[PDB]
Amino acid sequence: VKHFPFDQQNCTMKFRSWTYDRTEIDLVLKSEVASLDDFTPSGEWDIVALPGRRNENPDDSTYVDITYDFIIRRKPLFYTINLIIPCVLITSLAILVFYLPSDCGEKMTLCISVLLALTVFLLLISKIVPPTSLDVPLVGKYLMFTMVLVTFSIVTSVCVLNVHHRSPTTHTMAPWVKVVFLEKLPALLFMQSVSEDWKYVAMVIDRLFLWIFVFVCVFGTIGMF
Amino acid sequence: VKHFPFDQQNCTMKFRSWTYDRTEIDLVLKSEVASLDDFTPSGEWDIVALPGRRNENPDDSTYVDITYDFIIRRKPLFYTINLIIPCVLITSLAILVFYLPSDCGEKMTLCISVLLALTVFLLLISKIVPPTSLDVPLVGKYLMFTMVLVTFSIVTSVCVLNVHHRSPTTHTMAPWVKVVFLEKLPALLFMQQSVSEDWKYVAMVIDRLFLWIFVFVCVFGTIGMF
Amino acid sequence: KYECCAEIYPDITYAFVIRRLPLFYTINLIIPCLLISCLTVLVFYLPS
Amino acid sequence: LSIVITVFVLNVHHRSPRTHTMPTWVRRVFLDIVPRLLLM
Numbered sequence: 001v002k003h004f005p006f007d008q009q010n011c012t013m014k015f016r017s018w019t020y021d022r023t024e025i026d027l028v029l030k031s032e033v034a035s036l037d038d039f040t041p042s043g044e045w046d047i048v049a050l051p052g053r054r055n056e057n058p059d060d061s062t063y064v065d066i067t068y069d070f071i072i073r074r075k076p077l078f079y080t081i082n083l084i085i086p087c088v089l090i091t092s093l094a095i096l097v098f099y100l101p102s103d104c105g106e107k108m109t110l111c112i113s114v115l116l117a118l119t120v121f122l123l124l125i126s127k128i129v130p131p132t133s134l135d136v137p138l139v140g141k142y143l144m145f146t147m148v149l150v151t152f153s154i155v156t157s158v159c160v161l162n163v164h165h166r167s168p169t170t171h172t173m174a175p176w177v178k179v180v181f182l183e184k185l186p187a188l189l190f191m192q193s194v195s196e197d198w199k200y201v202a203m204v205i206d207r208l209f210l211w212i213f214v215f216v217c218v219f220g221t222i223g224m225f
Numbered sequence: 226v227k228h229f230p231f232d233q234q235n236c237t238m239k240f241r242s243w244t245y246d247r248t249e250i251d252l253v254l255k256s257e258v259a260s261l262d263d264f265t266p267s268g269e270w271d272i273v274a275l276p277g278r279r280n281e282n283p284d285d286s287t288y289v290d291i292t293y294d295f296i297i298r299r300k301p302l303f304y305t306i307n308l309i310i311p312c313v314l315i316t317s318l319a320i321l322v323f324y325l326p327s328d329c330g331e332k333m334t335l336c337i338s339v340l341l342a343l344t345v346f347l348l349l350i351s352k353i354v355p356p357t358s359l360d361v362p363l364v365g366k367y368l369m370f371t372m373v374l375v376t377f378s379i380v381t382s383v384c385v386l387n388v389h390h391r392s393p394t395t396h397t398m399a400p401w402v403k404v405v406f407l408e409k410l411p412a413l414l415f416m417q418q419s420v421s422e423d424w425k426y427v428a429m430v431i432d433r434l435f436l437w438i439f440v441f442v443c444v445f446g447t448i449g450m451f
Numbered sequence: 452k453y454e455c456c457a458e459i460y461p462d463i464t465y466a467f468v469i470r471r472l473p474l475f476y477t478i479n480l481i482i483p484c485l486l487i488s489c490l491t492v493l494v495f496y497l498p499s
Numbered sequence: 500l501s502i503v504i505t506v507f508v509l510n511v512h513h514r515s516p517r518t519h520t521m522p523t524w525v526r527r528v529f530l531d532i533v534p535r536l537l538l539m
């Protein structure tokens with residue numbers, strides 16, 4: 001399992017003798033595939049090739065076996081319809097909490113609902129796939145990476161929503177934020193009252209952080225190639 | 226399963242001999258329709274017709290069998306009551322989100338909860354049906370098409386709600402928006418005619434434009450049944 | 452030596468010491484639990 | 500049917516005469532139907 005569910009399995013089938021061995025009986029083959037004459041077609045899985053080999057150990061010289069290999073391709077439609085289409089339709093809303101304005105008070109609902117829907121899909125691909133730790137499938141790796149991206153978005157979204165609702169009654173105001181956040185703007189291609197200037201800084205720091213998410217989301221999905 | 230839950234299923238039965246062949250024993254039928262007058266009735270599946278015939282292979286000649294066909298039919302009431310009625314009662318709230326005003330603060334609750342109820346219904350319909358990948362049912366195609374309509378409504382709803390909450394000091398925005406978006410609307414059949422109340426009338430045009438083309442495809446694609 | 456009879460009885464006890472290769476439950480259980488566990492202290496930073 | 504009635508009610512609450520036009524008949528029927536239901 002790495003290309004789940006477009007995978008191509010390889011399942012072995014061994015045959016030996018039970019009481020005898022190579023100095024009393026000697027197994028030999030007839031033809032180099034299994035007969036597929038009475039194979040009814042299956043539905044889910046589809047065969048590709050069925051070779052048959054005879055193995056023999058040259059350090060022991062009392063050992064024959066005849067092993068068949070079945071190389072099986074999975075028809076990929078069903079798990080696409082249930083698992084790939086709602087995963088891409090949920091992970092297409094990860095970078096959309098930033099464009100939402102901070103006045104309406106709806107950032108937490110969108111970003112918390114995206115994080116819980118990705119965790120529910122990660123537990124479904126936990127309960128289907130076998131629990132080996134020799135490999136990890138590409139859907140769970142991509143969902144874990146976009147989960148890390150969504151919780152980094154929720155920590156920076158609560159910092160943006162803290163810096164939007166300041167006021168001159170509370171916050172002292174420091175001129176360092178004037179010299180940074182009025183020089184920042186033509187590096188972000190903008191154009192444009194002590195209380196309302198704090199509403200302008202929180203409309204900059206998200207649109208900086210929109211531009212480093214589209215730097216990342218067309219670097220990660222490029223990196224699956 | 227394409228016409229779920231109204232379909233007409235077909236299940237066969239082969240009777241073949243086991244250690245003998247065509248030049249030793251020979252299976253002859255007696256009655257073209259198998260007997261059905263000891264039948265207790267079945268509740269859900271009613272029996273439409275039930276023939277049986279003899280098959281014999283013209284190039285093999287070591288092959289006789291007698292195959293019966295069962296042509297059974299669903300009685301469609303219980304699956305209609307439990308999975309067509311709550312499906313339709315959920316999916317009629319896709320077009321509802323544009324008729325909210327933007328000032329209420331309650332758009333994202335409605336469209337996010339409609340998307341999560343739709344994907345729960347897609348997974349339960351996919352737990353009833355077999356995992357044969359040749360075919361999809363018509364319930365699964367319709368639910369996937371209305372789920373991509375609901376996430377398109379997510380994206381245009383957050384663009385509308387960013388357009389609504391602007392300000393005279395932050396957003397200037399240029400002549401083009403005034404020239405187009407105060408001329409577009411009586412060709413959209415409104416009846417109307419100072420920057421902070423100008424921006425909310427930009428926002429109540431564009432969702433009324435999007436209510437027209439989302440009640441368009443909801444009666445256009447649902448005659449994709451026919 | 453058992454309870455019934457006064458003779459003693461031999462037996463052979465096999466012991467199997469096995470470890471669990473831990474990457475599957477690491478990538479699917481303690482990453483989302485430890486990842487949402489850093490969101491518990493955050494609500495005090497949020498303005499009321 | 501209650502969710503369709505409350506999205507219509509929440510639409511008709513947040514209107515304003517700058518962006519809407521008051522019905523030329525709604526005053527008579529709604530100031531007629533407030534004392535039928537014992538309200539002011």
Ligand SMILES: *[C@@H]1O[C@H](CO)[C@@H](O)[C@H](O)[C@H]1NC(C)=O
Pocket residue numbers: 235236237294296
């Ligand atoms: C039912 O299935 C059998 C097996 O394929 C086929 O011979 C028969 O024509 C089918 N009949 C109908 C009505 O689908």
